[PDB]
């Protein structure tokens, strides 16, 4: 047999695999789960394209299902480049503000325990990358209207680098200032949904058609480009979500399965709530994207709460986030803008309803179901520890002020450069073109090239 | 460091999460597999939508693929409400006929050995919850022509409470009475396929178009609304069925993988059997829904058997089920109904053909591969325990009489209330016309409401 | 409790399961991960049907997505029949050239430790059978134009028997002659990709339409039947590939997750490389299938490498395989053949690029991360051992010589038996130009029978 004669470092590379069995630090069952979960979280990336392409009331030229592969490629590459480092490095340079570049090019990402200690660096980095790929596929879907492909890549890269990563460092790193503060966030109310959501708002305001003919009064609330596309994307997203929330436990203990039950319940309820609110708000008619929008809403709602709150409380978290989001979509008719408040009214707002409600129903008797793997939490309002709701709004503010600020800067800087302008203004574009090659899901038959925006 | 000081209870909640590592009664590898097996079982719900929406010789007003997220949401919620309780509670009400309401609202559910002791309560409930949502979707597809969406919600919820859960407790509860009798049903050939399949038959005979014109002598047998929908339906369902059967072993032992192999070989032979039977019955032409209909008929046939029967017998089961089901589709041209019997000829007849054949080929040596996790079965007819076919037939008839009677009562009772009758009669309806909105998979571009039947 | 009073045998059936707990030889977590990864690999089979039906510049009468359940059904069966035997028999019939038929009809495959000792036969046979079905699908892929269905079945069954199974014996069976020579092939650079690729090249030269109109000078290089098919096929494939490669570790150790991170990075870099090359070769226009084709190319290139090479080299293997496969599609316009050098230029050419570059970057310390489960390697050029590239080339030439020789003998044989002729010549064919029923994915609506070639 191959015999080892060394002890794991518990730092850096984690040890020498030639002389040290780095797997003894970890459980094979915890790894075999978070490994499968990784593959499962990724199938949410094309589910996010299928959803928001299909929900949109404007045909997009850049197919969002198609683009979601480019979102995978430049996010998987940004994560390898310096992404995993800037977020989840073992050493940070602030009050815990952003990581260093010790993990550039995935240098020394091998077998040391991560910020989740039940898992080696390389398995955590794989898992957490899909979270980035998910988020960056959302940010893509909020900013895809009349987008240009290469400035879209550059935008995504830079956005993930200077917006998602520092916020992930705050919330999920073992040394992030919001983790020390007390901000609870299971699977990314703040990191994935609040970030992508509000950059979707910051898109709507800075770019994106103002005074949009699709938002005029008396124009329908739902005119979906493809119902099928909305329903397929929810199948992938709901399925992928059991792994998104399940694996955030970091292990295979009761806590992971407790949080999948909370995840599906808050889905069912959030769905059934939206479906029905719309039934009344639309006059005894059953909406066609009503259910599916509700399902997603209740899933964003329970994202930050999944591994903290009681099962019954999920029902509450799904109903409030369903309703709150159903009403939030109506904000499209006050600004008279469409792009891309679709992403905002479900992820930005659902992210906030969730991160608060998280700090209300947060129980210690749920979190301890990870037993032996526990990183103890003080409790929430249902535990008579009342000041947790402030620790959440602290997270909600930092993650919001930073996204809303830096995304604004990023878009406007990219706008001053003609070579990188994300979206063209109508006076530049060859407006009105052979855009009949879209395309229920992607593009019409024998379409060899994507119909990109041109100028003059 | 943090330590735990208290022994698990083995009753009720099974322990105090805060003074008992509840996990120490279960293997993290067993749990992590039934956890992912859950999410896998769930992706069958829209597969059932797709497969029967697309196999239909009729445009359905209610898109089955759409209606499957609705069948997820009211089943997940019914499971949480009192579903897990009525079917799987630790104490039964007399003889082992139904469970108590001790798990109402998922009160008192976690870290306690369930009815499969290798799994806690909260995980066996998540896993088994998906089996509910799969039968909900099958009851849907059989009972959905001209169906109204809100009676259909109310119908599932009720059908799932007074038909599924009692038969579930009979066969899968530790204390159930069909367990004690000797009835073998690995993964639901009694609970899932025979019950939803026969609620299809009950639908065809009570509601659903009598003397349907699609069934006249000379009119074609197959004529699929959408072949793609059938095939992507089979893709999901087969994917799919591997966790459905594989996780029913309750553990990750050799037994799980012996039963995944039997699953795919029965599918492979159900498929080729139906496909080649159709080739000779249709005058030497390869049908478009023959292969996929045999794959599902074969997967149904092996469903009660995958964990007891030798691999080689999966061939015998796939070939006989796919044949018997092929004939059972011809039942439509004798009854002159359709509405109906697709969800019956595959699941109803398949579930029966399956469960009888489990009594004939069950082997003591195959069940035993579970190792230190076994419940030792005497075996079946090839172990010369002739008395097994009878216990299987005893299980069929118990499950068959309680479904035909209570679905008949539930459909007639509901047929008497204008607020809730599932399907409007031919005279109070108003055809068509919204077909121009259906829909290869769901609904046409920019549809906003589902074309619910309204009365004159 | 049930007590076990026997010891595992090591051979045949592994022991009597009635008196031995065969599970004690194996780790549940390892078995669990490779069991889920089985079903994950399966979903790659319709991905190959979706991907190559959409890439085609010719619309095919036999839908690859439809026929991919046929590839699945007859490959499962050929595995049960004698495929697992011929490839992974414990006793190879000299000198590690092909197995025996000791596992015929899956006799004795159960609990013995397989050719990967950390997994029982029955689980390793399930898992590896999916690699077969992936290959049978890729071989159906490149040989479907104007294919006849029953000859297509018989061709797959024999091609899987006398071409896939020997080569799998040589490089994967524990006693195989390329194993003991030194050839590294992690997850199927030779057995899966190089074989089916080169079988496409052999088809294209022998049966494919010579002097095809779609390849005359100035005819577009890309004219995809369906961008949506290409994108959905990549979603299933890229999801499934994480289990394809990750499960090739044979276990849940850090080597499995290290290999999944290589897999994704090479995909990402293969997609962007092709996408950017296409951009500059098609004159500043972004190709509609470029990004995806490079994703599949990169996943092909890293297939033999994933478990042996440093993460950073996945960038190199991705760019070189992306670019190399790009160039190779231009071969269609030198031979003036289309069907079916689509499969050749990604799988054939990517197999060889991948397997060579595996010998250059194999690293003893990456392989060593499986810790207690390794058979150590010297490594390749970067460990300063230069014999490894030799062993790679030896494996390439054996695999290439065999499939190019035997596929030709097999195609030319069948092509001389009127009723087994795979593809009718344009002079005996009826040429019913009813391509009107050939849909985007499968068949149009109410299509009933597949359109098989007939003769005047």
Residue numbers in the entry:
A (entry chain C), B (entry chain B), C (entry chain A): 2 to 457
What does the original paper state about this entry?
structures of the Mep2 transceptors from S. cerevisiae and C. albicans. function as ammonium receptors/sensors in fungal development. a central channel for the transport of ammonium. non-phosphorylated, with channels that are closed on the cytoplasmic side.
The Mep2 protein of S. cerevisiae (ScMep2) was overexpressed in S. replacement (MR) with the archaebacterial Amt-1 structure (see Methods section). the otherwise highly similar Mep2 proteins of S. cerevisiae and C. within the N terminus, intracellular loops (ICLs) ICL1 and ICL3, and the CTR. extracellular loop ECL5 of a neighbouring monomer.
